[PDB]
Curated annotation (Swiss-Prot), chain B:
Subunit structure: The cytochrome bc1 complex is composed of a cytochrome b (QcrB), the Rieske iron-sulfur protein (QcrA) and a diheme cytochrome c (QcrC) subunit.
Protein name: Cytochrome bc1 complex Rieske iron-sulfur subunit
Signal sequence residues: none
Protein role: Iron-sulfur subunit of the cytochrome bc1 complex, an essential component of the respiratory electron transport chain required for ATP synthesis. The bc1 complex catalyzes the oxidation of menaquinol and the reduction of cytochrome c in the respiratory chain. The bc1 complex operates through a Q-cycle mechanism that couples electron transfer to generation of the proton gradient that drives ATP synthesis.
Recorded superkingdom: Bacteria
Shown residues within the full chain: 109 to 161 of 429
Other notes: Was identified as a high-confidence drug target.
Subcellular location: Cell membrane
From Swiss-Prot, chain G:
Range within the parent protein: 276 to 440 of 549
Effect of residue 38 to A: Confers resistance to Q203 and IPA. Remains susceptible to LPZS
Protein name, per record: Cytochrome bc1 complex cytochrome b subunit
TM ranges: 60-80, 106-126, 143-163
Subcellular location: Cell membrane
Note: Was identified as a high-confidence drug target.
Similarity comment: family membership: Belongs to the cytochrome b family.
Record note on quaternary structure: The cytochrome bc1 complex is composed of a cytochrome b (QcrB), the Rieske iron-sulfur protein (QcrA) and a diheme cytochrome c (QcrC) subunit.
Main function: Cytochrome b subunit of the cytochrome bc1 complex, an essential component of the respiratory electron transport chain required for ATP synthesis. The bc1 complex catalyzes the oxidation of ubiquinol and the reduction of cytochrome c in the respiratory chain. The bc1 complex operates through a Q-cycle mechanism that couples electron transfer to generation of the proton gradient that drives ATP synthesis. The cytochrome b subunit contains two ubiquinol reactive sites: the oxidation (QP) site and the reduction (QN) site.
From Swiss-Prot, chain H:
Gene source species: Mycobacterium tuberculosis (strain ATCC 25618 / H37Rv)
Membrane topology: Multi-pass membrane protein
Any one annotated GO CC term: plasma membrane
Protein's name according to its UniProt entry: Cytochrome bc1 complex cytochrome c subunit
Subcellular location as annotated: Cell membrane
EC assignment: 7.1.1.8
Residues of the full protein shown: 58 to 280 of 280
Keyword Transmembrane helix tagged: yes
Organism classification: Bacteria, Bacillati, Actinomycetota, Actinomycetes, Mycobacteriales
Amino acid sequence: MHIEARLFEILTAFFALAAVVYAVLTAMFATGGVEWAGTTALVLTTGLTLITGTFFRFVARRLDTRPEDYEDAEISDGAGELGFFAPHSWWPILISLSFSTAAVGAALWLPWLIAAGVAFVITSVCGLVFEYYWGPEKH
Amino acid sequence: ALLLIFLFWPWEFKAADGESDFIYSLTTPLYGLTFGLSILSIAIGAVLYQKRF
Amino acid sequence: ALFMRTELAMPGLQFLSNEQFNQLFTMHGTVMLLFYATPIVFGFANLVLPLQIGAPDVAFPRLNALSFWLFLFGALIAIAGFITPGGAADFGWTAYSPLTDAIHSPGAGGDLWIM
Amino acid sequence: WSDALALGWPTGITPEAKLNRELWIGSVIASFAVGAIVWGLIFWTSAFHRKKATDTELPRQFGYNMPLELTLTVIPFLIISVLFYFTVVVQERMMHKDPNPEVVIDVTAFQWNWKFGYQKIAFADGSFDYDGADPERKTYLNFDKIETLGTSSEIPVLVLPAGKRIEFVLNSADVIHGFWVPEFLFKRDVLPEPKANNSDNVFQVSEIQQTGAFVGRCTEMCGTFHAMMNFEVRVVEPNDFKAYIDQRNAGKTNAEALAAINQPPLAITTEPFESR
Amino acid sequence: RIKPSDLGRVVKRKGQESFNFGEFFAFTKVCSHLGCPSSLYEQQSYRILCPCHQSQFDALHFAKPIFGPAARALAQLPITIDTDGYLVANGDFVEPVGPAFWERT
Amino acid sequence: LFGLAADRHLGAHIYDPANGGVLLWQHLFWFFGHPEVYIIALPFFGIVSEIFPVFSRKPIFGYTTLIYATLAIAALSVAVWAHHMYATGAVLLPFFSFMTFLIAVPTGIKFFNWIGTMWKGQLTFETPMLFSVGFLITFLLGGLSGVLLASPPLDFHVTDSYFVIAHFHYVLFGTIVFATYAGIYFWFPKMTGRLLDERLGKLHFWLTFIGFHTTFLVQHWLGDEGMPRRYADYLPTDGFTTLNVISTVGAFILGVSMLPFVWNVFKSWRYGEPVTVDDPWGYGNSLEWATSCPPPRHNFTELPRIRSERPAFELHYPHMVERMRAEAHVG
Amino acid sequence: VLGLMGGLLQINPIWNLGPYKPSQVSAGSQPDFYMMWTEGLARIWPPWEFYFWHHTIPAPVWVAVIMGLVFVLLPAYPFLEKRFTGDYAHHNLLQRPRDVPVRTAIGAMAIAFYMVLTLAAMNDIIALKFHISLNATTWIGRIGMVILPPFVYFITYRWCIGLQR
Amino acid sequence: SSALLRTGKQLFDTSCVSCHGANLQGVPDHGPSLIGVGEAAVYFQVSTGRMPAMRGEAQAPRKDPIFDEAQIDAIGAYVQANGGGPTVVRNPDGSIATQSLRGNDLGRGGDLFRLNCASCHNFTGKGGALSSGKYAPDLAPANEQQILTAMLTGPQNMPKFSNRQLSFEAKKDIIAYVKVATEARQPGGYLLGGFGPAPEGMAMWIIGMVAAIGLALWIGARS
Ligand code: HEA
Ligand code: HEA
Ligand SMILES: CC(C)=CCC/C(C)=C/CC/C(C)=C\CC/C(C)=C/CC/C(C)=C/CC/C(C)=C/CC/C(C)=C/CC/C(C)=C/CC/C(C)=C/CC1=C(C)C(=O)c2ccccc2C1=O
Ligand code: HEC
Ligand code: HEC
Ligand code: FES
Ligand SMILES: [Cu+2]
Ligand SMILES: [Cu+2]
């Protein structure tokens, strides 16, 4: 993919420019020196876009043309078998209930509720991860 | 371990605020922890034997 | 918002209080900005993005339902401060710096708000 | 004619207020012109091109007009550059802070009322010099000798001369409050510890032309009784101010010190709140 | 002991107008629903709370119940002082104390 | 928020005014909070830009220009966060003032592209087009008031007053409410197979428009003269007691304006003229109007050949590609 | 399991309490969880008494008859169901709960009623730990006792038919 | 330097006059008079943090204190100079006292606690719920002088125990019982919060029954 990488490179360039400009303009002309709270956010949003753009760049350099990236193409090119898309599942609502229990146990300071919520989150996430890998029962 | 704990552990009531015992407060938890865990291990071994042999 | 307006007409405190008015504008701002707009964005997205790009489904189909249920239960948690005898959160929508401390604003509605 | 184009801005009682009002009027007229142009465009294209008339094949499939887009992306840059320059000029002017003031007030805002200080009086006339600082502070707050303190039953009235440099030093005891006098066309936040937070809590007023009484509000979120922190500002003549000060130096309340110079003792723009 | 400030919000049930000695009232402590001690006394709402099932009686209105399955008022005891300055009882309850039964309260 | 909860439940000395705790919270919160308003603003720009060509019978004016304007707004939205903290006297004013003045431009090019797409077409005003035009008007007024608000010496007076409330209510309402109603009236058939009523839609639109413009217009004047936000009471000796009455009348009109919409949705979901075709709004685009009106599970039974950004239009009108490619650059 | 949880968790610490005396009381006065429904029913039942000639019928009589009615309706259910459905045949194969929607809905309604009665017994603990008014919890129980069972019935019926589909 | 309550009436004027008045007169909207009260009331109300209070409702909760560095003494002396309320106990150094008020007798202290105090709080000093909002807090984090001044001044909706109906030995013994009951072990395992059978039933249903049903699912087949 060539255009996504270019988008992220544009964003990273602008963010780095803005971060450096803000840092050096608040080093002077400011009440107490460098501002130290917007500077950090700016360098690390630069780092975010940089990470994403670099990953996309490597994947693009390690890839041959794709029917999506390619113009000139027809629908007989993508004829094949896509991945695995999960049909019906009921684990998400249980995960959300467990996380909400832990959150309300953290709002009102109740340690037992926090412990129960964490245990339920571990259980529900385990159920979600193993859903399509449990084998038949051994009897 | 249950037998040894029951025989040789300080069990008498010692509570006060001068000599914080903390050894007496662990006397019943140890009884339970040894007894229940021993019999649970026996049960699990039996279930495994039935399931695999 | 209608409660707020009907109090703001006719100078004098006719039927509300100061605490109740503060809670009203706080919860109005919070609900209208975070429990109606940000999720309606993803509502329209889930409706018509895969159709527009010509795809059969979204990338991760169970993360979708997880997101919806998280939204719903977080909203219900934050709103359920009105059944507390002290009321909901009473600072602004923006929760300025020392007013949301433990000394000022000591109720149990701010905790539910945050979580 | 200008009371309408000001959209209800009160006329100033300070030179910088009048500069601010001039800038406001100019910018309002500019934005109104832009809005009128664009609304005319919309009403036109919806009133005449609406004619999906008796006959139709399909109108035309045109989508790119490069020179027009370049023109309409280059003009707004200039239109904003002009006003950016003007606003920089005016906001630089309104925050001058000349070194030597003539009256220095210490404004303290605590939970739902005010307290004013009278830190120093030094006329450029050589007519009146006074110092009210106090080591009563046995630590960022300022304590003084002549302190008009407001309570829930009396609106604190601040008295100032007319035609002198005034300086306000803003400090808060608990939380953030707001210091707004709608006639100064200016406001500033009253922070708890303004120096540890890198905010300058000092602003000056060049002169106050008109005399009278003016109301002030809080413009922050203080808590329950935020809407009940009003105060008043009485601007009197320099000699009347000197009489007020020297009669206050002899132990006397604000009400009697105000009555002794033939002025109403209580605030005339604001009344205490029954619904508190 | 009722604060002298209020002493004007008392209602004084029809048969017991003189059962109090100044600011002392001396109600019973056995809840009139099932007999738990109604000992939770809130000093500035003047409410007595039974902790077993949460009834509420109004100490300023002859201990009239104002919440819950409780339906009958608490019994009041007449008090006075003797020739030496000690608190004594000035008689007996006008009615049975405690839960109700088939015969009467 | 985790820092705040730690400070509330453990006494964590994170936001004390003794440290830089008062401005730290404001910096963090507003660095979050301005991207939030742009997050809830952009997709509705998309919605209206997607509704306009269907009812104008024209292509979208300046495709790549709109894409670049979107990217520019996105990039600029994170470096203006401190124009909400003018009155604290603790920020570098020229930087943020200039950069908000800068972010004012791409929205202008977007607006001009919309007006150009409506220019010299064949307009028909069904409910989505009507709501989109309302969006245009309201957002223009709100953005004008905002760019007026962006200068520091004026924000020195109108900040924390009802002028700000009127401003962000104009932008918020005009964007979310109007574009959302447009999207609902537009994509109701594609998700249901029925058609919403149109007389009820027009009644709904006019009620909403009148009530809104009568509840929020006088608040500019109401806040220019001193009346700050977040007051529960005021005195009769003060002015502004008639403007509050006008505003509350408008608020009640806005409140009553919601009955036609919910009645229309409640009736038209079960009854209501069915749709037995693709593309009930003829001259559609975007590949969603090329599948059955209630789409099947997995959304597609066949795809068309894709050559431009209007594939459904070229599918339903094959005698038009020569004219779409020939005269696509006159302007 | 019983040995483990009898060694590691504490139950009924009678020494923290005192000997029984008719003059003193505490705040948590609940019974074990199998009588909590009886206590909750006594808490949320309104004060309806009858006074006629020389006599008195107090409120807990209501608790008595409701308790007895429950204990009489439990053992007599199979005969009620066979009278109502009219099916008298021998059966040795069980039913899945999704194939009998009406009985499943009845059972879910009864379980919801029992849960409401049990939660109405820990009013003090709930109102103290979770910051809610006490009168609020009393009225919540008093109204839930009427509106929760039918809601649960409706949802359970629709859910069973959804599973069948 | 006891002739110095100029501090005192320096903090009151900037933190209290909006709700009690400039002369400690009880603004008829929010606050009480504060004239008959003494140093003990101010100490208990400020040291626990319930003072200077925001909006104010059914119960002002406990918060973090604002004042120390001997300014609780300043406000206390300033308020005592305008009335004759009770005063805080002091040790031979002038500071506020402690472990000498531990009623060497815990039997009498516990009987007095169960008769007078346990009705609202608990058997062992946990919380208890009152009517319409208000509750009775937990007795764990309060120190000795706070317990004494609490039962001496009678804070909001809590009865007032004078020194004539509850002598000083009685108070010391109650303090000792409270401080011992909040700091003793549980010699039977993990106590489930201090309350009765509700946490016990919950722990049964959510530990023992899930263990039993999980082992039943593991052992027996499903069909
Ligand atoms: C959903 C949206 C939303 C949007 C889109 C905006 C858009 C803008 N906002 Fe607004 N704003 C808010 C929501 C929004 N805002 C909220 C919620 C608050 C405060 C909330 C809080 O404090 O509690 C707020 C507050 C706020 C403030 C500070 C108020 C304060 O003092 O407290 C400022 C100015 O600094 C501001 C500025 C702008 C600017 C410059 C734009 C610009 O994006 C708009 C530019 C738009 C135009 C329409 C221009 C039209 C273009 C043409 C026609 C070309 C015209 C050219 C010239 C005139 C040059 N906003
Ligand atoms: C996306 C957002 C959004 C929307 C839609 C609105 C909608 C409205 N807002 Fe709000 N508003 C904000 C965001 C929004 N607001 C924000 C951010 C603030 C300031 C935040 C703060 O200060 O902290 C604010 C503050 C604010 C104030 C001032 C508060 C203060 O004093 O400072 C006012 C009133 O003057 C107001 C009014 C309205 C009105 C009249 C509407 C009308 O649009 C709404 C009309 C709506 C209806 C009436 C619903 C119809 C209801 C019925 C039919 C009742 C039926 C009931 C049942 C079935 C349950 N808003
Ligand atoms: C199913 C049956 C009840 C139908 C009977 C048919 C009916 C028509 C006969 C008439 C009955 C009358 C008319 C109404 C009945 C209502 C009530 C008054 C009956 C009294 C006794 C009654 C018969 C007992 C039945 C109650 C019922 C069967 C309980 C079973 C619950 C289910 C099946 C457990 C499954 C697994 C379980 C959920 C593991 C998770 C743990 C959860 C949290 C359990 C919930 C929970 C429970 C259940 C507590 O009891 C409890 C007590 C104290 C503190 C906390 C809890 C608690 O959290
Ligand atoms: C109006 C907000 C408010 C502020 C600010 C405030 N108080 Fe209070 N105060 C109250 C209220 C309301 C009560 C009634 C007690 C209650 O109901 O909890 C009270 C009660 C008291 C009491 C106990 C009265 C009694 O009869 O026992 C004292 C002592 C006291 N305040 C002192 C102070 C001190 C010291 C300060 C810190 C300078 C302060 N107040 C600030 C509202 C306030
Ligand atoms: C139900 C009536 C009631 C009685 C009886 C009662 N309390 Fe209180 N107690 C309360 C209430 C209500 C408060 C909260 C007062 C406040 O927050 O201002 C309280 C507060 C306290 C506090 C402060 C707790 C803290 O953490 O700050 C202590 C200590 C205390 N009481 C001790 C006692 C003692 C000892 C007794 C027995 C002599 C007793 N109480 C009897 C209701 C009561
Ligand atoms: S025993 Fe007092 S309420 Fe039932
Ligand atoms: Cu204020
Ligand atoms: Cu601001």
